[PDB]
Amino acid sequence: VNSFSGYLKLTDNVYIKNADIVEEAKKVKPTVVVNAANVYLKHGGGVAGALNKATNNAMQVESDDYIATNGPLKVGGSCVLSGHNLAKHCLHVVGPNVNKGEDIQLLKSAYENFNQHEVLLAPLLSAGIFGADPIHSLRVCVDTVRTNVYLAVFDKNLYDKLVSSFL
Ligand SMILES: CC(C)(O)[C@H]1N(c2ncnc3[nH]ccc23)CCC1(C)C
């Protein structure tokens, strides 16, 4: 039993909700919140920009030190950093950005990072400003993640379409 509330159950381990991941994180304080990161951990917009804003830019400060030490992530890769005031940890995961021409096949690799954590609060990778089809992202998530994932979908019209079209 966990403290996530109001989710629809899609499969044995995948759950979904119309919610702002920022507000969800502040309520549950999950062990892991997933950020929709880029390889430079520049949290300027989308989910990443919103999460960072909620940390009063502390996420960006920590991220800049991480990049200065380690260099950029790989597309499809991840790193674990602090969750600041939102969660114990933030798993920064880089899904491919279609608006940069990045390979969509890398979306499965991106979701594989979730399997290193027993329970996660997450957005749909590569959706939104990353340019991929959120319906497809949900399919890859369900077919790749085996650990318990609680998906927050910000757009209500999209949440309804994701539910109604889910196979
Ligand atoms: C890009 C995507 C799939 O995560 C969705 N995004 C968010 N999902 C959850 N929590 C959020 N908080 C701030 C943004 C945000 C942004 C727009 C979207 C398409 C509905």
The 8-class DSSP code of residue 134 comes to H
Q: Using a CB cutoff of 8 Å and minimum separation of 24, what contacts does 26-30 make?
A: 26/54, 26/85, 26/86, 28/3, 28/4, 28/121, 29/86, 29/87, 29/88, 30/4, 30/83, 30/87, 30/88, 30/119, 30/120, 30/121, 30/150
Q: What is the DSSP string of 45-69?
A: SHHHHHHHHHTTTHHHHHHHHHHHH
Let me know if residue 3 belongs to a domain. no
Contact 100, 66 (CB under 8 A): no
Q: Crossing angle for the helix pair 156-164 and 134-144, nearest 10 degrees?
A: 60
Count of structural domains within the chain: 1
Let me know if residue 22 belongs to a domain. yes
Nearest to 82 by CA among 56, 45, 46: 56
Let me know if residue 25 belongs to a domain. yes
Let me know if residue 79 belongs to a domain. yes
For residue 20, which atom of ligand 1 is closest to its CA?
10
Distance 22 CA to ligand 1 centre (A): 9
Let me know if residue 2 belongs to a domain. no
* Expt. technique: X-ray
Distance 19 CA to ligand 1 centre (A): 9
Virtual CA dihedral for 110, 111, 112, 117, nearest 10 degrees? 120
Cα 84 to chain center, whole Å? 16
Let me know if residue 85 belongs to a domain. yes
Let me know if residue 33 belongs to a domain. yes
State how far the Cα of 59 lies from the Cα of 110, in Å rounded to an integer: 20
State how far the Cα of 84 lies from the Cα of 136, in Å rounded to an integer: 31
Nearest to 43 by CA among 25, 55, 33, 31: 55
Let me know if residue 16 belongs to a domain. yes
- The CATH number given to whatever domain includes residue 66 is 3.40.220.10
Mutation choice for ligand 1 from 15, 26, 124, 158, CB with most ligand atoms inside 8 A: 124
Distance 47 CA to ligand 1 centre (A): 5
- Give the domain range for residue 71: 8-163
